[PDB]
Amino acid sequence: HRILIERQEMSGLIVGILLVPQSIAYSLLAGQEPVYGLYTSFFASIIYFLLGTSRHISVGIFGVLCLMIGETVDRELQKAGYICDKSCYAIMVGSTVTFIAGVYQVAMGFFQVGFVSVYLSDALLSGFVTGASFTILTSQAKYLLGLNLPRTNGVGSLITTWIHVFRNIHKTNLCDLITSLLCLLVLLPIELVVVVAATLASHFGKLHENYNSSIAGHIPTGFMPPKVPEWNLIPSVAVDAIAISIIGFAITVSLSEMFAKKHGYTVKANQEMYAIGFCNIIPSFFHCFTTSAALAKTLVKEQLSGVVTALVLLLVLLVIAPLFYSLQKSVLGVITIVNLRGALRKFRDLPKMWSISRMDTVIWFVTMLSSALLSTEIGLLVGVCFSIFCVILRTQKPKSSLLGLVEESEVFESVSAYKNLQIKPGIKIFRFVAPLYYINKECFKSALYKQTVNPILIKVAWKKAELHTIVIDCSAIQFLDTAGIHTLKEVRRDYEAIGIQVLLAQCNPTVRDSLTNGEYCKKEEENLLFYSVYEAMAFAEVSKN
Amino acid sequence: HRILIERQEMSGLIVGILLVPQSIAYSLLAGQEPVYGLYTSFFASIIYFLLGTSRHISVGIFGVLCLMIGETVDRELQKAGYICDKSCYAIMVGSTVTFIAGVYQVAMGFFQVGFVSVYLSDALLSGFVTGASFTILTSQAKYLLGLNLPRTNGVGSLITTWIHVFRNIHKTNLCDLITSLLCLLVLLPIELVVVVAATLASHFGKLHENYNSSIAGHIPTGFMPPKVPEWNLIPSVAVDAIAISIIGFAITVSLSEMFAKKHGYTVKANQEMYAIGFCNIIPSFFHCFTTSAALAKTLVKEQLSGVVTALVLLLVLLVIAPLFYSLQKSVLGVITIVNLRGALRKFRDLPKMWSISRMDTVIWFVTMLSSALLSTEIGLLVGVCFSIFCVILRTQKPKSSLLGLVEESEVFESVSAYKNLQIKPGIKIFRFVAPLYYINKECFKSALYKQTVNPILIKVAWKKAELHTIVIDCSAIQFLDTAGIHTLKEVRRDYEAIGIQVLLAQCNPTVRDSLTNGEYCKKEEENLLFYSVYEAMAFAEVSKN
């Protein structure tokens, strides 16, 4: 009773006016002069308009990217202790990091090795974004309170800044706090009106006369010399540029793909990789720090309209620049806070994530904690690795149950999950859902010994002094590592020694090849491998009689 | 046409005489006085006899363990630049590492958290052992040549020592080389005769008169004060002790289990963990450096006989000690080389490993290279992580094929691997062997779009301007992460929009719960989930007509 089978041989003005206040900071947070953030936004929009495929996205300054480049800039400053002065040296450092990141992105795009973008899960990404949003929140807290705490960096930056704030809660400006409260209650085209009102009030009332920290005049136009990167700092920033490029292009391709799935569906991942690479090389020579697809802006916008944004930026870089100076830094802080509100709202729908899948929620929380309390790069690395390990954990504990026959059908279901299932005596069909390899080898052996009889104990009892065949269903066993071949041979040998016959059913072609290479089936011994659970069970029934 | 199923609610003298020459070195390699290796062997045998369960093993000095403790000792010496003198300080350092490793082992045994022992595969272990064997070979090369190269440590120790040897190949003793050649040709109870002859020749001929480096007199007995560990160096050695304890107890349990499987089969893993823990704490207070199950000795032996070994050791520690001094260090080198021959022979059977499984062979080679060229601890870590990643790689590229019906049966086989399979027109049964999660989501979508039609392209062609149902077999899909739920919903939506009906078959109970929680099945929409490939295919056949 066997079957023989043979194998084969426009709206841009809004964003453009939202980007002006949304840069000074993302530039101040980045630790550079405010006009250079505007340079970054302008060059990013212009470059993406020249070449790009998203057709609905706002590439440019990305909070998290600015935070990472700022952390790298601060570390390089502390290492060097810095013509170069202060702003210029940091700006060159940022440009060097940008050039290296763009080179990495373009190399990955050309090599077609962009598969490294699949290790992010979007849950790791949401957690990482939320952690960075909290980090930006604490960074802007000192502008919110008009404080003057010393610069801090490294693991535990969040808690260190918070405890410094607690140390000198007092001795504030008390005008920045008041205007921050006013801007907060207004915010909760609102941003444009808010910045206009704040600028008008600061200019009319002479806020800086009361020691209120405000934005100084940023040099209009300028930037005439296209200073190339120094390239001596290349080794000192390469490791940071790796993570910067990975995050930037992964977020860009994710946003492009999601918007294309919304409509159009014409986004080519390799083309976006090329575009984000050239959005970090050509601008890098033009005093820029980074570029990536911005989550919030994209929401504000929702690529010709992008040109409009650039135009507005150019106007702000041509004649509207003095209209924006002498503006209190607290307004930039509250603007940053209300833009991070969008990423912060992900907390509200935490139960929805918990209901769908628990391990993902656990990965999300672990990534959040590692990317907020610890450093950003360490947080992302902890996230990617934790996700890879979680896949391993699912294999280590694997569903395993006996199988029962469904009446008037050949369907074999799980008796531990489905009721009214018939099992004839002397036949036990074991089912192991996960792959069998070195990790769950002991678990597979223990589960089989528990559901069925234990051959070793019964043999030792016999030496001191019902069930006759076992049908091991391998339908769900995707691969069998060297340890698996040995485990299966050992199981068969023990059960043969006790007096039981072990039958393998529904084996994958790959598992069949692995068993054949391991000499499990000997030389056409037969009665060991079967193509269906039903056929093997009927064969056992015949063999018993 | 559906089925309704409801869910449930003696020989010891030989080893003892082989251990004397097999310690001086494993002590010299460890960077300590030779008599302390004998102390370690004696205390290990005595402790394991008092408590233990292997009943066939030779716990004691393990080459790799001695190498690791010696590397830690050398690094601590360089950090401190060292009453303490030279030998005593290093000995205290080793004892501290031993105490910390024993504490770690006993804590893991008590906590029943020994599951961390399942991440080694025995292929990673074989590669790690081979790499350490090469490291010991290069370390003993300088005794083989009677050289005097300066001490080296860190990543690239092997190549650095080799290039130093090349730098001064000349200016050798030329007597140590000759006696090493003689011992080599004799070796290739042989070891006992060899050491006896070497000692007799060295004593009679006055080899050290010709600047031949020989073993100095080691203090007989002694060790009366049980000097407790300093405990100030505890933080400086904890990270090394972690790896030391993991390797030691994993090797011990592996050897105990394999020998028990050979016969007896009474080894309890937790009891062995406790024993190896107490084999590194009580001796640690008695001037010992480490303890683990030795691979080679065990072969020499093959626990009452272990006592015999201790007795011999005690005699060597009582009155036979001066019988062993003034013995050329080259003899110890050749003895170490011929004992590493056993681990080196694993190269000969490399094709056998390649035939059984290729990825394991790749893991073995990667671990070998990382544990020989780079440092030992970095090699082991590179091994464990690489193995965990390799499981991920198998999922990223997953077998995927269409399914065909087997004549006069309900068996559905793979048409890409099995011939003479019937597929009626308009039905395509896709099979995805690996789990569906964030890693292979794109691969699953691409494979399905390739074998069947591509809904997005056909829809865009229709907008610019045969197959009617798809049965997705989920029998091998163990788990569905949040991304999987979204991918399946997107696939169903696209195929519904084009005009095709998507059917899921043989879903696991866990996958059913995941789909239900993700609102894939809506509210009893039916005709979406089926318990068998046959039932869903017949339902499609009826629905077409």
Swiss-Prot record, chains A, B:
The chain crosses the membrane at residues 10-29, 34-54, 91-111, 114-134, 233-253, 275-295, 304-324, 373-393. Ubiquitously expressed. GO terms for molecular function: bicarbonate transmembrane transporter activity; chloride transmembrane transporter activity; oxalate transmembrane transporter activity; secondary active sulfate transmembrane transporter activity; solute:inorganic anion antiporter activity; sulfate transmembrane transporter activity. It catalyses: oxalate(in) + sulfate(out) = oxalate(out) + sulfate(in); sulfate(out) + 2 chloride(in) = sulfate(in) + 2 chloride(out); oxalate(out) + 2 chloride(in) = oxalate(in) + 2 chloride(out); bromide(in) + chloride(out) = bromide(out) + chloride(in). GO terms for biological process: chloride transmembrane transport; chondrocyte differentiation; chondrocyte proliferation; sulfate transmembrane transport. GO terms for cellular component: apical plasma membrane; extracellular exosome; membrane; microvillus membrane; plasma membrane. N-glycosylated. It is a multi-pass membrane protein. Keywords: Cell membrane, Disease variant, Dwarfism, Glycoprotein, Membrane, Phosphoprotein, Transmembrane, Transmembrane helix, Transport. Belongs to the SLC26A/SulP transporter (TC 2.A.53) family. It is linked to Diastrophic dysplasia: An autosomal recessive disease characterized by osteochondrodysplasia with clinical features including dwarfism, spinal deformation, and specific joint abnormalities. PANTHER family: SULFATE TRANSPORTER. Sulfate transporter which mediates sulfate uptake into chondrocytes in order to maintain adequate sulfation of proteoglycans which is needed for cartilage development. Mediates electroneutral anion exchange of sulfate ions for oxalate ions and of sulfate and oxalate ions for chloride ions. Mediates exchange of sulfate and oxalate ions for hydroxyl ions and of chloride ions for bromide, iodide and nitrate ions. This is Sulfate transporter. It comes from Homo sapiens.
